[PDB]
Design a protein around this ligand. Structure first.
Ligand SMILES: Nc1ncnc2c1ncn2[C@@H]1O[C@H](CSCC[C@H](N)C(=O)O)[C@@H](O)[C@H]1O
Ligand SMILES: [Zn+2]
Ligand SMILES: [Zn+2]
Length: 824
């Protein structure tokens, strides 16, 4: 508390409502703008309030005030209790307070990164600005005070202003008013400038197409079946991706008025509607083969609110292009094209109107060390983004290492445990026992890897031994690499639940470590499906950038994907964290289906083992054109599949081809197997108290536990076409949906695993039509691997390599964001 408060010196500036001072005397103690201060919280449980004094003034009401730019205590960030008690973080929170509330002046030191940062391997301090919505720690702003604002300079305030300014709609150029409306030639929002003739992204529900579309005649309940023949059919008891953006060319821009001035909150756009192929009568079955970025011109017009505009996109008439459709297309983000118009009325494709026509810096590649390199999915995505050149890779497992070499003739691959390699460099060795030159300080500019985080699954609290386990884990080793090499950029990829293992303590300790090193850092979850692959794959991503750099953003989703598979947010101690991703529903491109992925692949049989066979056909999908290339390439590699036992071979043959088919479609029949053995009939000799009798008067239990009792030891039945254990525990596991399931042509892969098993956790691994599990190549296609991408070892080795990889299209997306950080 402060009672004796008097100004010192001449006022710095006198506004109309405030008189500013540079110094004040509080209880005989000098205080200055720039000083830091503590304030005692009313809530005794909260950490002490801490602020920088950015300004001093008197209000007309006789109050002597300061502006408090608050600090954030470590425990109020993701770090929580892992954070240094003495570390503060900057935040965009500030306010006006009565000087008399100050409890004490405090010393707050700015711990700046040493000028020799690359070689580094009781007072409060700070180093980073904390963004609490995205969990980003970043370098403090470089912005300096001007003479004009030197008296009130507040980073927090300046930041909020810049946000507001960027966020808000503004009209750049007015044309004329017509009937209570100002028409404009140019506007802007969120940093994007939209002019007449530009194209725009809009939510699916922004407008409607004029084409008539008869509601799909669908089908009544499927054909009924005999429940003794199909005893598990009843357990089937009880097209979910949104649409991609609407797209339109801007024809006019007009807004209302307030006080004789433009109402910018009321800007409206009139657009020429564009048709995606699947928007025409062609629908989807008519667009399987079309480019994902091809559109159709239309003279249909729509009025839309600027507020709804989700972004800007380029749409060009094919013929006006100075380059090839392909070159133009792969040239930049948000690039579309058309070659025809579409008449909603005659359902015909005319030539585009005349008015639809036009008017008639090389970056250094980052030298990259890829730890836990695997077969190189991560390094491949980066290469594609053009941001890196992986010069060094470490992979303990020989086959994967070899695979890496096959794809990267130029990188020195150390097939070795990362722990012993690091010791070797610590040992001063220039070389490993094989003459291979170890990477040193300065060599490594970008460090990436996916450290297997094996233990830690039991999400109970961190104990003393647990902390030791972690200190000896591979994620820590990876951090050791970061600490020694001090790279410009750091990427740690992992399974989604990296963020939640042991109450998120794994996540918190690695962020704590990155912060301790002085790194900018953040984390997030991404869904590979949203970057152009036909698979559900949520992954964790920890990003870090060296003091002098920009911290990259997480890439905006490119493809629409099943919402249920796009739960990207993570809760840490009840706090919900999200990434900067803005596209929370729709997106530019349609979802990539199983069909796009592997409809061109020649037919193979269970156990097929010929690793080199010819494509006997052309790419059918856009996706297949990308992955197979335009280049001459006649050889289809690794189109081989596991050789399932005769029993399992039999089960597969008996899963029907209807979309969604799985083990519950299996007939309860005896089969003579391909060995001379027998798949027997499963027998039901217990009541399932929950499921009752069937229509054939049959019982439905295969164990005593189906009647509420304990399990009969004798219960288990062997060598039976319908796996015994599935009805056994079906009730407690949503009837094991998906097990022995066929992929749907219209659907997507379940998470691509190291060893696809019909009876594994996610067992929807059967080809949609053929009687076998998916091939190594097919799995590679479910990830984003080009067809030329090589793998190595026996079939299981290759599956392992493919299931382990980061899909290159996901990696590429991340790569481009880092690329943004390389400008200037
Ligand atoms: N101690 C260790 N040292 C080096 N590599 C290890 C290791 N322990 C496990 N690994 C390897 O780390 C890999 C993690 S899988 C990551 C693959 C890579 N990100 C990709 O996109 O392809 C596995 O292949 C595993 O063999
Ligand atoms: Zn402020
Ligand atoms: Zn039982």
């Amino acid at each position: 508390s402060k009672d004796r408060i008097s100004w010192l010196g001449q006022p710095m500036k006198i506004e109309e409502n405030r008189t500013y001072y540079q110094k004040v005397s509080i209880d005989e103690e000098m205080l200055e703008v720039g000083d830091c201060v503590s304030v005692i919280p009313d809530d005794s449980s909260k950490p002490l309030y801490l602020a920088r004094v950015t300004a001093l003034w008197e209000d007309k009401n006789g109050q002597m005030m300061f502006h408090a730019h608050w600090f954030c205590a470590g425990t109020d960030t993701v770090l929580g209790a892992t954070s240094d008690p003495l570390e503060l973080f900057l935040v965009g929170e500030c306010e006006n307070m009565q000087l008399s509330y100050i409890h004490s002046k405090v010393k707050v030191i700015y711990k700046a990164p040493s000028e020799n940062w690359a070689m580094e391997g009781k007072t409060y301090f700070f180093q980073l600005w904390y963004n609490q919505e995205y969990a980003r720690f970043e370098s403090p702003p470089k912005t300096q005070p001007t003479e004009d604002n030197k008296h009130k300079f507040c980073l927090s305030c300046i930041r909020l202003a810049e946000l507001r300014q960027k966020e808000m709609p503004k009209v750049l150029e007015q044309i004329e008013e017509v009937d209570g409306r100002v028409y404009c030639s140019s506007i802007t929002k969120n940093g994007v400038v939209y002019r007449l003739g530009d194209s725009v992204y809009l939510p699916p529900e922004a407008f409607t197409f004029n084409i008539k579309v008869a509601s799909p005649v669908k089908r009544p309940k499927k054909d009924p079946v005999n429940e003794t023949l199909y005893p598990e059919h009843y357990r089937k008891y009880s097209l979910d991706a949104p649409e991609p953006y609407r797209i339109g060319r801007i024809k006019e821009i007009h807004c209302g008025k307030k006080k004789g001035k433009v109402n910018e909150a009321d800007i409206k756009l009139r657009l020429y509607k564009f048709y995606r192929p699947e928007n025409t009568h062609r629908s989807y079955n008519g667009s399987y083969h079309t480019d994902i970025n091809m559109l159709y011109w239309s003279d249909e017009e729509a009025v839309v609110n600027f507020s709804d505009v989700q972004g800007r996109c380029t749409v060009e008439y094919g013929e006006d292009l100075l380059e090839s459709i392909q070159d133009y297309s792969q040239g930049g983000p948000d690039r579309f094209y058309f070659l025809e118009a579409y008449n909603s009325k005659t359902k015909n494709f005319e030539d585009p109107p005349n008015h639809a026509r036009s008017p008639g810096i090389k970056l250094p590649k980052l030298r990259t060390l890829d730890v836990f390199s695997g077969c190189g999915g991560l390094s491949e995505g980066f290469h594609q983004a053009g941001i890196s050149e992986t010069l060094w890779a470490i992979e303990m497992w020989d086959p994967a290492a070899q695979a890496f070499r096959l794809n990267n003739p130029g990188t020195t691959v150390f097939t070795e445990d990362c722990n012993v390699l690091l010791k070797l460099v610590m040992a001063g060795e220039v070389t490993n026992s094989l003459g291979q030159r170890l990477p040193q300080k300065g060599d490594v500019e970008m460090l990436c890897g996916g450290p297997p985080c094996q233990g830690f699954s039991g999400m109970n609290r961190f104990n003393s031994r647990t902390y030791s386990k972690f200190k000896n884990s591979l994620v820590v080793s990876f951090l050791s690499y970061c600490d020694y090499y001090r790279p410009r950029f750091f990427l740690l990829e992992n399974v989604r639940n990296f963020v939640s293992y042991r109450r998120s303590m794994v996540l918190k300790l690695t962020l704590r470590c990155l912060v301790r090193m002085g790194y900018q850092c953040t984390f997030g979850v991404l869904q590979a499906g949203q970057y152009g692959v036909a698979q559900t794959r949520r992954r964790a991503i920890i990003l870090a950038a060296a003091p002098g750099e920009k911290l990259p953003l997480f890439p905006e989703p490119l493809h629409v994907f099943a919402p249920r598979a796009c739960q990207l947010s993570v809760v840490v101690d009840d706090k919900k964290f999200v990434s900067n991703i803005t596209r929370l529903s729709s997106g530019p491109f349609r979802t990539i289906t199983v069909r796009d992925t592997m409809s061109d692949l020649p037919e193979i049989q269970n156990g097929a083992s010929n690793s080199e066979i010819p494509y006997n056909g052309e790419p059918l999908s856009w996706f297949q054109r990308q992955l197979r290339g335009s280049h001459y390439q006649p050889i289809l590699r690794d189109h081989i599949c596991k050789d399932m036992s005769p029993l399992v071979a039999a089960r597969m043959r008996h899963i029907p081809l209807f979309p969604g088919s799985d083990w519950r479609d299996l007939p309860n029949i005896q089969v003579r197997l391909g060995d001379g053995v027998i798949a027997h009939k499963l027998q039901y000799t217990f009541h399932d108290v929950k499921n009752g009798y069937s229509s054939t008067g049959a019982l439905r239990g295969v164990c005593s536990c189906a009647e509420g009792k304990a399990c009969d030891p004798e219960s288990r039945q062997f060598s039976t076409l319908i796996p015994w254990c599935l009805p056994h525990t079906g009730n407690r596991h949503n009837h094991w949906a998906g097990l022995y399931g066929r992929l749907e042509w219209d659907g997507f892969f379940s998470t691509t695993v190291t060893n696809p098993e019909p009876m594994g956790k996610q067992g929807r691994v059967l080809h949609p039509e053929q009687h076998r599990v998916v091939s190594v190549r097919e799995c590679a296609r479910s990830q984003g691997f080009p067809d030329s991408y090589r793998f190595f070892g026996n079939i299981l080795d290759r599956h392992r390599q493919v299931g382990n990889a980061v899909p290159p299209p996901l990696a590429k997306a991340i790569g481009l964001e880092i690329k943004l950080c390389l400008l200037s």
